[PDB]
């Protein structure tokens, strides 16, 4: 019930008490660990007040006014409001604190050393999809910042009766399209094939290239979603070259500078924010290892290996591994040279370790999902590989949610 975590390179041991404040289930039971499962599985008035109270208590505790008249007044006010209006509204301060802490609590995010510097854009006054498009352009421009990226979240109106949800249908603000071809193959990004079909279905005139920035498909107030194209001038892209291989540029590879997860649900004080796109900056392996080398993504390893002239007749030459490293040298070098913020996995993981220690010291723990935190290349040469971690759910939190095309009731 007070749990210890050990680092096996440094022999440092930290003691976790924060996990006792953990709310929802993990997936795992006593007889079965589901640690490697990616997805392991509206609120009534009575459901909402304990949640609201739980949140408000931590808010007022953070500003050193726990048990104050200010605290008791707010709790009563919110209580009155849920009783009468079946939901409630957060003050701006509570929204900002909640969104920062959702990030602070995000156990799969290696970038949390930065958690308190989040720029929060309150888009709760938004009513239409054009409003949504304007908010998002402003977010994209604020966050990109000419290549000197800055973290931000834009929060649209909270779910009410579940029939007036705001959603961004995209999985990220900026992603490339995918097209299934007549020769069975895939052009562009296979991750996005379905969402691209939905765009075309809804009107999008697809260019049918490899790196087509997808349009935004935005749903306001439960209405049917509408398409909008992000101003091209707002989408910073980086062309991929290698400092030593002149032929690399001829692979014709680019990637975008701004990672902006847009399909998650932000839960604060029981309230549910279904449209809450957020952005930081890339760790290099995200692009070089996963986006480029997953067999089900752009799957370029063989192409690169061939051009490096590696011995590909046997796995034990480690040609896959040699290519992977060079692909990742190229990503990093390309971003650095264009002056676009990017972090390498060594620097990223060392910062997370420093953050874990800070968090253990000042908060009594840090929920972390080892499976996600350890990079997909060179695991054991990063310090996080050697670090025991405890994954648990704290609120406020970011949550996965059903893709909306599986759920939406098309009015037409």
Ligand X SMILES: N=C(NO)NCCC[C@H](N)C(=O)O
Ligand Y SMILES: C[C@H](O)[C@H](O)[C@H]1CNc2nc(N)[nH]c(=O)c2N1
CA–CA dist 81, 306 (Å, integer): 65
Q: How far is the CB of 46 from ligand Y (least distance, A)?
A: 35
The token pair at 411 is 């009015």
Pick from Zn ion, ligand HEM, ligand X, none: which does 287 bind, CB < 5 to 8 A by kind?
ligand X
Q: How far apart are CA 370 and CA 199, in angstroms?
A: 36
Sole window of 20-28, 227-235, 251-259, 398-406 interacting with a second copy (rule: CB under 8 A):
20-28
Strands, sheet with 271-273, edge to edge from the N-terminal-most edge strand: 271-273, 265-268, 397-399
- Interacting span for ligand Y (CB under 6 A) from 18-26, 70-78, 234-242, 386-394: 386-394
Q: What positions carry a catalytic annotation? A: 109, 112, 281, 286
Helix (H) or strand (E) holding 201: helix 193-201
Can you name the residues that pair with 131 across neighbouring β-strands?
none
- How far, in Å, CA of 125 to CA of 132, rounded? 10
For residue 345, the minimal CB distance to ligand HEM (Å) is 8
Q: Which stretch binds Zn ion (CB under 5 A): 20-28, 51-59, 126-134, 287-295?
A: 20-28
> At its nearest, how many Å lie between ligand HEM and the CB of residue 379?
12
Q: What is the torsional sign of CA 201, 204, 209, 211? A: negative
CA pair distance 276, 19, nearest whole angstrom: 26
DSSP state of 153: E
Phi, psi for 95 (deg, rounded to 5):
-60, -50
Of the listed pieces 43-51, 58-66, 127-135, 293-301, which binds a second copy according to CB under 8 A?
293-301
When computed from its CA atoms, the radius of gyration of the chain, rounded to whole angstroms, is 23
Q: Note whether 287 binds ligand X by CB under 6 A.
A: yes
Is 44 near a second copy (CB under 8 A)? no
What are the residues facing 120 on neighbouring strands?
153
Residue 47, helix vs strand vs coil: helix
Nearer to Zn ion, 58 or 387 (CB): 387
Query: Does the footprint of Zn ion cover residue 37 (CB under 5 A)?
Result: no
Q: Which residues bind to ligand HEM, rule: CB under 6 A?
A: 103, 106, 108-111, 114, 118, 151, 153, 261, 278, 280-281, 283, 286, 343, 348, 372, 398
- Binding site as annotated, residues for L-arginine: 172, 281-282, 286
Q: Which residues bind to a second copy, rule: CB under 8 A?
A: 3, 5-6, 8-9, 19, 22-23, 25-38, 284, 289-290, 293-296, 301, 315-318, 320-322, 324-325, 328-329, 332-333, 336, 344, 346-347, 369-371, 374-381, 385-393
């Amino acid at each position: 019930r007070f749990l210890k975590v050990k680092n096996w390179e440094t022999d440092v041991v930290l003691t976790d008490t924060l996990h006792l404040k953990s709310t929802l289930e993990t997936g795992c039971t006593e007889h079965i660990c589901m640690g490697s499962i990616m997805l392991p599985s509206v609120r009534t008035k009575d459901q909402l007040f304990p949640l609201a109270k739980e949140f408000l208590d931590q808010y007022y505790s953070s500003i050193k006014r726990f048990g104050s008249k200010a605290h008791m007044d707010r709790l009563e006010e919110v209580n009155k409001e849920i009783e009468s209006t079946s939901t409630y509204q957060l003050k701006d301060t509570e929204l900002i604190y909640g969104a920062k802490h959702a990030w602070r609590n995000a156990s799969r995010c290696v970038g949390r050393i930065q958690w308190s510097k989040l720029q929060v854009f309150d888009a709760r006054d938004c009513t239409t999809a054009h409003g949504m498009f304007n908010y998002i352009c402003n977010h994209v421009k604020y966050a990109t910042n000419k290549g000197n990226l800055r973290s931000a979240i834009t929060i649209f109106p909270q779910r009410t009766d579940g029939k007036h949800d705001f959603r961004v249908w995209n999985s990220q603000l900026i992603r490339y399209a995918g097209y299934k071809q007549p020769d069975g193959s895939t052009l562009g990004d296979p991750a996005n094939v379905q969402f691209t079909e939905i765009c075309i279905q809804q009107g999008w005139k697809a260019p049918r290239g490899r790196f087509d920035v997808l349009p935004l498909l935005l749903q306001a107030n439960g209405n049917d979603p509408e398409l909008f194209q992000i101003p091209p001038e707002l989408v910073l892209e980086v062309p991929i070259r290698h400092p030593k291989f002149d032929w690399f540029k001829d692979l014709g590879l680019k990637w975008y500078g701004l990672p902006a997860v847009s399909n998650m649900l932000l839960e604060i004080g029981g309230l549910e924010f279904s449209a809450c796109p957020f952005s930081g900056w890339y760790m290099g392996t995200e692009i070089g290892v996963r986006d480029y080398c997953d067999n089900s993504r752009y799957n370029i390893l063989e192409e690169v290996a061939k051009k490096m002239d590696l011995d590909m007749r046997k796995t034990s030459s480690l040609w896959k591994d040699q290519a992977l490293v060079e692909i990742n040298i190229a990503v990093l070098y390309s971003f650095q040279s264009d002056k676009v913020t990017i972090v390498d996995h060594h620097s990223a993981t060392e910062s997370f370790i420093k953050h874990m220690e800070n968090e253990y010291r000042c908060r009594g723990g840090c929920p972390a999902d080892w499976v996600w935190i350890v990079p997909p290349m060179s695991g054991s040469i990063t310090p996080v590989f050697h670090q025991e971690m405890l994954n648990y759910r704290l609120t406020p939190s970011f949550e996965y949610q059903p893709d909306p095309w599986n759920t939406h009731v098309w009015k037409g």
